[PDB]
Amino acid sequence: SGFRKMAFPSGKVEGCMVQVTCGTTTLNGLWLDDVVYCPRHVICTSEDMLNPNYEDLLIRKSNHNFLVQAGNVQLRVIGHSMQNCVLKLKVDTANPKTPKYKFVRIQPGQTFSVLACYNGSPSGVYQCAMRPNFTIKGSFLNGSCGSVGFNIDYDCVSFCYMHHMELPTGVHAGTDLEGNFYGPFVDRQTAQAAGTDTTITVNVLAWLYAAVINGDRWFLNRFTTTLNDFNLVAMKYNYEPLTQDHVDILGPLSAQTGIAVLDMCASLKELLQNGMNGRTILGSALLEDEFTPFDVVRQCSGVT
C-alpha cells in the first residue's frame, strides 16, 4: 500500500556522469562508450550567451580546450563535434560502466527520472513529467545543466532528456539526446515563453485508479457519462480531451478495479465542479497529473 512519486534507481546513470569544463564554464556530461554528451553552450563565454553563433565558436576550439573529469581522473579528449544543441566529445577511454542504453524522444504527458548533478557529481533523484507545453517542472540550480532524464526497462536505460536552461517562469527546458529541443526554445540567454499549459487528463484518471487500488474510495459515485459530454467539461477546466485510445490505455486499471473509465470520468467531473471539501486523495489536496497509467501499474499492487 501507499503511493509515492517514485524514481528509477539511479546507479546505472550515476556511473555515466562526468564534468565538462571549457574556460570558466563547467557543467555535466554523459559518458557512454567513448563519447561524452553535454550541452553545447559549455563553449560560450558570458558575452556569447546573448546571441551565440555556435558554428563559429566551435571552429575556434580544439580538443585541448575541453577538460573532462570522471571523478578526479581526467579524460583525454581526442575529437569534438556538434549535433544540434549537444556537443559530442570523443575520449580515449570507453566508459567501463556503460549500461545498455538507447536515445528515445518522449511525448508530452510521459514521465521520467531526473538525476540532478553539479560539477559531474550526482546530488539527487526525482520524477518529472514532460508538460503538454514541452517544459518540465524540475528542481535545478545554476550548474545543473547537462543533467539527464531517463527511464529504465529491464536494465536498458532510455535517455530522453538533457537539461539546458530555466525559463523566466521557473520551469525548465532541454533537449533529447540528439540535441533537439523539446518545445519552441533555443539555447541562448533571451527571455522565452512556453505555450499555455493544460492538465494531463489521462494521468489524473490513472491516479484516481491508483487511489481506488489503495482503498481511497470517497470520490466514487454511481454515475456514468459519455466520451463527448465529459470532454465538454474537460475544455471548461483546461483539461486535455479524452480519446478512445486513452480509455484503452486505462483498460487494465479499469479491469483491475471494476470501475469503467467513463464511470471514473463522472467522479472526475464532480471533483472538478465541487472540489474535495477538505478531503485528500493519496495525500494530495489537488488532482495530480504527473503519474502515467504505466507509473500506476508499475508501483501499485495487481489486486485491488
Added chain:
Amino acid sequence: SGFRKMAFPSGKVEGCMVQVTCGTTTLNGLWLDDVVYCPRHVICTSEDMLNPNYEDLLIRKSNHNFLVQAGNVQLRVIGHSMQNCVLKLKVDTANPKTPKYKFVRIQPGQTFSVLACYNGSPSGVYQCAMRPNFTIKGSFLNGSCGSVGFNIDYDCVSFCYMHHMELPTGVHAGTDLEGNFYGPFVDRQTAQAAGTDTTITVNVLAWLYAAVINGDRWFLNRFTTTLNDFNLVAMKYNYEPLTQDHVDILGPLSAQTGIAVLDMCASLKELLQNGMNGRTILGSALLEDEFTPFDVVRQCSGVT
C-alpha cells in the same frame, strides 16, 4: 528554481541489495563486507508468523537453510546469528561494492531515502519522513521487506531503516539496522496500532522558507508573534510545539530570506486559520511537513 521531493542517488545502495530465501519465504537483504542483514521473519513459515518464537525457529536452522543470491550468483553462507529483529548471515565473499557506511538511528521528523526492492532487485527510490508516531508513509508491496532507508553525506551511507511490515492503516513499520523497531511494534502478524500522529511544525516552516526562496510570497504578512502564543495555535491544529532549538535550526533559512522565524509563524498561523483560498505553495494545496530544514538548504539556492 523549483522544489521537488528529492531522494539521494541510490547507486551506492543498489550494489548492496541481495535476495535471501528460506523455504518458500523470499525477501531482501543488505550485503556489507561479508555480512547480509535481513528481517528475521524470513525464517518464519505461514503458521509461525501468528506468534513466532524466533529463538526456537533459528536454532532449528543451519547455514544451508539460507539461499542468498547477488543477482544470479549464489552467495555461500558460513554463519548465522540474530541481533534483535534482524538476521545476520555471514557469507564467504566480502561485497566488493561495500560503500563507506554506518548504522544510525534517526529521530521522528527526520527524512531519508528508500530504495524499494523486490527479490533482491531495486525497483524505485523515494523520500520518506519518520512520523512522530514512528511509522513511515511509504509505498511497499508484499516482498518489499528488507528494503532499506538511508541518507548520504559525502560518500558515506548512513543506513537508518530496514522495512519489516505494513500496519492495518497502510502505514509502514521497521527497525534500525541493529534490529530495534522504531515505535511500539513487534514482528508478528497481529493487528498493531500506531500512536496518534502530529504534524512536524519545524518542517512546515522550513518548507515555507523554501517557498520564499523560490519566489512564492503570497502567504507572507507583516505580523509577528511570540513563541508561546504560536504554540497555543499549534496545539489547536495538532502541530508539534515549537522550541527555541527549532528556531535556531531555522536560523540559516531565516537569515537567507530576511524573514524572522516568529514572523513566519504568523503566516503559518494565518494559513492554519484561513487555509489557502484556492492558492498553492510550491505546487501543493496542503501544508507539507516532510522536508527538514536540511532538506531545504540542500536543495534550494543559497541566495533568496
